[PDB]
Write a protein that binds this ligand. Structure first.
Ligand SMILES: Nc1ccc(C(=O)N[C@H]2CCC(=O)NC2=O)c(Cl)c1
Ligand SMILES: [Zn+2]
Length: 105
């Protein structure tokens, strides 16, 4: 149970080793303005994504950070967001836990 893949297509996305405790915990339960609730896991690093659009600070769950939508680069499924423009760390990923599949190397 080391590697996280895209649940839809199996694209390699991230590792458990790259979990990042932002503000005390790697898991944050959040809701967007459309009322959708997400369990978001924070990662220092990710791969196999495609970041779409320019960064936006509107409705950012993480103070000091602007967000870009992160799609699965393979199948185009929305996996979360990339965060940038902040400090300690400058950038990180917030990925939707239930859209990932955990398994071995
Ligand atoms: N009409 C919509 C529908 C959904 C959204 C959304 O998911 N927004 C996220 C972006 C990442 C974040 O940190 N906070 C959010 O709220 C937005 Cl901004 C407008
Ligand atoms: Zn995928």
């Amino acid at each position: 149970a080391s590697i996280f893949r895209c649940r839809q297509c199996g694209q390699t996305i991230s590792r458990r080793d790259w979990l990042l405790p932002m503000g005390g915990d790697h898991e944050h339960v959040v809701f967007n303005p459309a009322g959708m609730i997400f369990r978001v896991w924070c990662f220092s690093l990710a791969q196999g994504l495609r970041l779409i659009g320019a960064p936006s600070g509107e409705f950012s769950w993480f103070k000091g950070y602007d967000w870009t939508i992160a799609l699965c680069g393979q199948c185009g499924s929305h996996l979360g967001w990339h965060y940038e423009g902040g400090s300690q760390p400058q950038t990180f990923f917030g990925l939707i836990k239930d859209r990932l599949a955990e398994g071995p190397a």
